[PDB]
């Protein structure tokens, strides 16, 4: 199947959904460093 652009990032908790919107992808501007998330882009059954 195809991969997906959603914030509903798995295993990883309330440390994924943060510098992004409710539909995924980094929300612009911000003081991002290393280990952050910019574009939620993960598939089920991968």
């Amino acid at each position: 199947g195809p991969e997906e652009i959603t914030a509903d990032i798995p295993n990883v908790g309330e440390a994924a959904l943060s510098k992004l919107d409710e539909s995924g992808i980094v929300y612009i501007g911000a003081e991002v460093t290393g280990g952050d998330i910019l574009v939620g882009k993960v598939t089920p059954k991968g």
Partner: protein, 208 residues
């Protein structure tokens, strides 16, 4: 209806108020009404965003809202696009100049209200209530709660005879006034009926 409300008993000591303004007997009721309205609106809007505490504070004919939320990104959206939108509606609701601030909630597993909400959501999407409760308790413990209790009640597993079940872990002193007991509640509007979720989270004792 045995127990006193844990927030309510502690407002003078360890817990603060949400609405934080002065008004004379003339304008007080109106203010309260406004607060109720705005809060209601906010809840409606930011349901998908994990929101814990709306703190209203109005000085000098201008309303200052402070939204405590776990994920600011979904409440803010694009930088100053969603917040701005919210603001004008808030102002309209009030009838004064509005100002929205957004506090970022560190550790949403330790915030009680948020946990409750999560539990409710889980219930709605047809999980085993017990497993959800366990998760709630465990997570909080992991995060560094001195203790947590959660309680769920009524039509559990769609059963005809309603009952309440509750899981405690650590220590949750309610009679002790100086204990920081974050209490809050929620309601799962399931197919069989409502399921009320209470949760107490003991952060620790304050010394003063």
């Amino acid at each position: 209806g045995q127990k006193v409300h844990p927030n309510g008993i502690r407002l003078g000591i360890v817990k603060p108020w949400n609405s934080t303004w002065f008004a004379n007997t003339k304008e007080f009721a109106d203010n309260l009404d406004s607060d109720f309205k705005v809060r209601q609106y906010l809840t409606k809007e930011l349901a998908k965003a994990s929101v814990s505490r709306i703190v209203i504070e109005r000085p000098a004919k201008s309303i200052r809202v402070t939204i405590h939320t776990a994920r600011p990104g979904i409440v803010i959206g694009k930088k100053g696009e969603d917040v701005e939108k919210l603001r004008k509606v808030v102002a309209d609701i009030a009838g004064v100049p509005a100002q929205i601030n957004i506090a970022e909630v560190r550790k949403p597993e330790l915030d009680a209200k948020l946990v409750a909400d999560s539990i409710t959501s889980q219930l709605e999407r047809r999980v085993m209530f017990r497993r959800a409760m366990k998760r709630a308790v465990q997570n909080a413990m992991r995060l560094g709660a001195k203790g947590i209790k959660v309680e769920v009640s009524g039509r559990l597993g769609g059963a005809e005879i309603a009952r309440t079940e509750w899981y405690r872990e650590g220590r949750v002193p309610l009679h002790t006034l100086r204990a920081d007991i974050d209490y809050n509640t929620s309601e799962a509007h399931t197919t069989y009926g409502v399921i009320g979720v209470k949760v107490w989270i003991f952060k620790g004792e304050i010394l003063g």
